[PDB]
């Protein structure tokens, strides 16, 4: 079936917990060899070890995605261990509400963490994807990227930039055989949140991971440049 990742090699960032952990484990179960990375070296090792215990192939490494030396070490470790790179999941990111008069370093950090990092990791992975005959990049954005609200100058604008980068670089890397899509996750684990969620329950990490698996699999081979919101039907961030 096209919904598997047979013979894939997937790098997942921010994968020690939450969404990134669920994607790592789901991708391994679907047949991918997984390079599990996280800011915290022990958290990444834990998830890679759990994947190996369950029968999958995985290694875990420390990677601060804002550190160019860490980025290059992940690319090299994927190639040394598994010989190619075909999938990159840019899940590491962060931030949140901040006042309009925030220090400029806070505003700039949001772009370094949420945007400059993945872009650079996309640059680093793309030639190896092309040489492997194609691949898939997946960016984890945020519903703040399409929404408008108070205290969102840095978080909303940096995640919107992730969305627009996704749509644009699909044109650049399509001819290399590479698809690029994004997922905007909703609230993943109260009564207030449920009032704005038509499906009436909070999201699970597995919900994001199932959509990630689709967008990174051959079942989505002709889908690129899309931002898919996984929110239970809700629109409010």
Ligand X SMILES: NC(=O)c1ccc[n+]([C@@H]2O[C@H](COP(=O)([O-])OP(=O)(O)OC[C@H]3O[C@@H](n4cnc5c(N)ncnc54)[C@H](O)[C@@H]3O)[C@@H](O)[C@H]2O)c1
Binding site listing for NAD(+): 16-17, 19, 38, 64-65, 91, 141-143, 155, 159, 186, 237
Please tell me the distance from the alpha carbon of residue 99 to that of residue 135, in angstroms, as a whole number.
Answer: 39
Taking the least distance from each CB to ligand X, the nearer of 46 and 102 is: 46
Among residues 56, 60, 156, 185, the one that binds ligand X under rule CB under 6 A: 185
Q: Please give the C-alpha separations between residue 177 and each of 132, 208, 218, 219, in angstroms, as whole numbers.
A: 9, 24, 12, 15
SS3 115: helix
Please tell me the distance from the alpha carbon of residue 20 to that of residue 88, in angstroms, as a whole number.
Answer: 12
Q: Give the number of residues in contact with its own copies, rule: CB under 8 A.
A: 42
Does residue number 233 form part of the binding site for its own copies (CB under 8 A)? yes
| Active-site residue, 155 included | yes
**Per-residue binder mask for its own copies (CB under 8 A), 139-168, x = binder:** ----------------------------x-
Q: Nearest CA to 111 among 66, 81, 147, 151?
A: 66
What are the strands, taking DSSP E only, across the chain?
A: 9-12, 33-38, 58-62, 87-90, 135-140, 178-185, 227-230
Among residues 43, 56, 60, 135, the one that binds ligand X under rule CB under 6 A: 43
Does residue number 123 form part of the binding site for its own copies (CB under 8 A)? no
Catalytic residue among 155, 161, 165, 215: 155
Provide, rounded to whole angstroms, the least separation between the CB of residue 81 and ligand X: 19
Q: Which residues are catalytically annotated? A: 155
């Amino acid at each position: 079936s096209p919904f598997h990742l047979n013979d894939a090699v997937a790098i997942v960032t921010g994968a020690a917990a939450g969404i990134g952990r669920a994607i790592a484990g789901t991708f391994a179960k679907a047949g991918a060899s997984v390079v599990v990375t996280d800011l915290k070296s022990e958290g990444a090792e834990a998830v890679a070890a759990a994947i190996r215990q369950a029968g999958g192939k995985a290694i875990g490494l420390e990677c601060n995605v804002t550190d160019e030396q860490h980025r290059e070490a992940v690319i090299k470790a994927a190639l040394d261990q598994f010989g190619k790179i075909t999938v990159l999941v840019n899940n590491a990111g962060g931030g949140g509400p901040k006042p309009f008069d925030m220090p400029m370093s806070d505003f700039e950090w949001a772009f370094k963490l949420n945007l400059f990092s993945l872009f650079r990791l996309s640059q680093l992975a793309a030639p190896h994807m092309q040489k492997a005959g194609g691949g898939a990049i997946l960016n984890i954005s945020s519903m703040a990227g399409e929404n408008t609200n108070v205290r969102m100058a840095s978080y909303g604008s940096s995640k919107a930039a992730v969305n627009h980068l996704t749509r644009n670089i699909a044109f650049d890397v399509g001819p290399m055989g590479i698809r690029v899509n994004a997922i905007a996750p909703g609230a993943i684990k109260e009564r207030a949140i449920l009032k704005h969620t038509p499906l009436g329950r909070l999201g699970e990490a597995q919900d994001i991971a199932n959509a990630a698996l689709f967008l990174c699999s051959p079942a989505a081979a002709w889908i690129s440049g899309q931002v898919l919101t996984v929110s239970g039907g809700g629109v409010q961030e």
